[PDB]
Amino acid sequence: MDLPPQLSFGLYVAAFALGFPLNVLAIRGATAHARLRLTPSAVYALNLGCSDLLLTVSLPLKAVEALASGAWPLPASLCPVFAVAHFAPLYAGGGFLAALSAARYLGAAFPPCYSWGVCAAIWALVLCHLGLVFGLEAPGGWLDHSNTSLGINTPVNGSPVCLEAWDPASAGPARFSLSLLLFFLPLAITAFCFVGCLRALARGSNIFEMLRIDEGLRLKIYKDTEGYYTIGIGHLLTKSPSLNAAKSELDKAIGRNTNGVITKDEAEKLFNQDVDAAVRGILRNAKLKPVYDSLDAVRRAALINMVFQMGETGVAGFTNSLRMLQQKRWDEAAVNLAKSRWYNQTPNRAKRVITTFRTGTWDAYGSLTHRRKLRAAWVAGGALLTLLLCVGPYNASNVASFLYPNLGGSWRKLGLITGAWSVVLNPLVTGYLG
Ligand SMILES: Cc1cc(OCCCS(C)(=O)=O)cc(C)c1-c1cccc(COc2ccc3c(c2)OC[C@H]3CC(=O)O)c1
Numbered sequence: 001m002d003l004p005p006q007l008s009f010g011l012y013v014a015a016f017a018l019g020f021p022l023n024v025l026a027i028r029g030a031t032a033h034a035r036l037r038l039t040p041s042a043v044y045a046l047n048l049g050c051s052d053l054l055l056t057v058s059l060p061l062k063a064v065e066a067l068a069s070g071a072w073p074l075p076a077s078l079c080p081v082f083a084v085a086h087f088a089p090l091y092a093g094g095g096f097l098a099a100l101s102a103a104r105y106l107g108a109a110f111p112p113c114y115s116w117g118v119c120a121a122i123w124a125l126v127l128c129h130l131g132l133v134f135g136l137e138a139p140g141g142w143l144d145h146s147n148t149s150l151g152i153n154t155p156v157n158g159s160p161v162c163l164e165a166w167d168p169a170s171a172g173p174a175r176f177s178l179s180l181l182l183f184f185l186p187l188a189i190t191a192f193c194f195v196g197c198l199r200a201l202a203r204g205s206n207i208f209e210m211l212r213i214d215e216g217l218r219l220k221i222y223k224d225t226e227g228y229y230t231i232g233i234g235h236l237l238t239k240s241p242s243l244n245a246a247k248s249e250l251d252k253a254i255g256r257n258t259n260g261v262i263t264k265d266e267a268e269k270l271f272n273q274d275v276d277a278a279v280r281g282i283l284r285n286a287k288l289k290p291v292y293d294s295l296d297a298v299r300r301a302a303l304i305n306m307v308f309q310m311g312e313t314g315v316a317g318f319t320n321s322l323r324m325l326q327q328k329r330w331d332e333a334a335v336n337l338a339k340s341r342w343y344n345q346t347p348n349r350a351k352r353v354i355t356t357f358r359t360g361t362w363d364a365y366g367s368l369t370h371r372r373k374l375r376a377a378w379v380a381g382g383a384l385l386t387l388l389l390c391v392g393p394y395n396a397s398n399v400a401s402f403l404y405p406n407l408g409g410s411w412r413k414l415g416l417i418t419g420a421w422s423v424v425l426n427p428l429v430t431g432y433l434g
């Protein structure tokens with residue numbers, strides 16, 4: 001179950017070669033974003049980029065160690081610099097990944113000083129923790145009164161080992177404790193945020209924003225696509241071929257001599273009345289009521305949308321689709337509605353409403369806040385994946401060999417390799433490339 005030393009070498013070199021440019025680009029993206037705007041996510045990504053670049057730069061030393069079958073073939077004095085450059089990022093990374101995913105989650109689900117403090121604390125924890133254990137209890141450390149270089153064990157003559165032959169009785173509790181705090185806790189935070197991002201999308205909008213998107217806003221009377229006098233947020237004034245009749249209905253509905261021009265507050269009031277009317281139209285129609293009642297929130301909005309555009313009786317004529325919707329036969333319903341004159345007359349809007357019926361999500365309505373929520377979900381999902389795939393096995397190895405010290409070194413070796421590939425997968429998931 002031992003990897004050939006060449007395979008290990010190659011795996012570390014590949015992570016190094018890819019990780020260096022990837023993290024230089026990530027740092028640059030993050031640095032351009034903070035400097036232009038200045039946001040928490042950018043700060044966490046910058047710290048994650050710097051830490052990954054530090055890990056990256058340490059990897060060639062891990063590579064040559066592998067080629068030497070675990071022996072340290074470099075000056076002994078390099079071992080402490082390697083110690084910090086390699087393992088501080090291996091623990092700090094998870095903290096920054098969780099922070100980023102929490103920043104993205106909160107910024108999108110609930111739309112500077114904190115960020116930097118949080119990063120300082122992560123760094124302070126990792127450096128004091130590793131430094132104090134290492135400084136105190138590593139071979140050559142404060143407690144060692146021998147002629148030993150700091151961090152070097154020599155299990156047999158001529159065979160110095162940096163870190164990896166360290167007494168598990170010292171290294172194990174340190175690894176274990178820090179893995180709980182800086183991996184497993186972040187993992188749970190990241191999973192929580194990922195779930196939160198998904199729920200936020202599921203209920204991240206409503207009929208009002210959806211119809212605003214579909215209807216837009218005009219303050220002066222205009223002719224809709226059929227040529228009827230219309231105002232505000234898709235408010236039909238009249239079908240009549242008469243501007244005066246249109247002005248007269250406008251004035252009546254507001255309580256004022258508008259002269260065909262209204263404010264944004266007034267348009268918003270009408271819009272509210274029209275949506276209530278469309279909702280009341282549904283509830284007093286024997287064909288629409290039971291369908292509406294059986295529907296989740298997002299699909300109710302789609303049905304309200306149709307009624308707002310076509311009125312209760314128009315929508316009630318779609319008897320097959322309605323039946324489908326009540327039976328939760330989404331795709332069958334969509335196939336029917338696609339054949340409608342409605343789909344033929346206004347296909348962009350009809351596709352958006354019908355897609356909303358098929359999926360039950362707001363994805364057809366790519367508003368700024370929806371895309372920000374999508375962005376957040378992808379970042380937390382990517383973070384979850386990189387936590388589980390890369391530094392995950394390493395930290396699980398730390399936990400396992402602490403609880404079961406009977407375990408051999410095989411699992412730790414592989415966990416170190418997957419941990420090193422975090423320098424590749426991290427910059428790819430944080431979203432700051434280009
Ligand atoms: C404390 C110190 C002292 C130091 O003196 C150098 C001068 C030598 S002289 C003039 O006095 O002769 C130099 C350094 C860099 C440091 C240091 C500061 C901060 C963190 C770390 C890394 O510490 C680890 C590294 C890995 C591990 C540590 C600690 O614990 C376990 C395992 C991780 C694992 O297996 O998961 C060194």
Ligand SMILES: CCCCCCCC/C=C\CCCCCCCC(=O)OC[C@H](O)CO
Pocket residue numbers: 040095096098099100102103104106112113114115117118121122125181182185186189
């Ligand atoms: C605060 C000291 C932290 C050190 C403890 C290390 C333990 C590692 C666990 C979690 C790190 C991630 C915690 C979540 C940080 C995200 C905060 C955030 O979302 O910031 C938005 C904005 O700045 C708000 O005003």
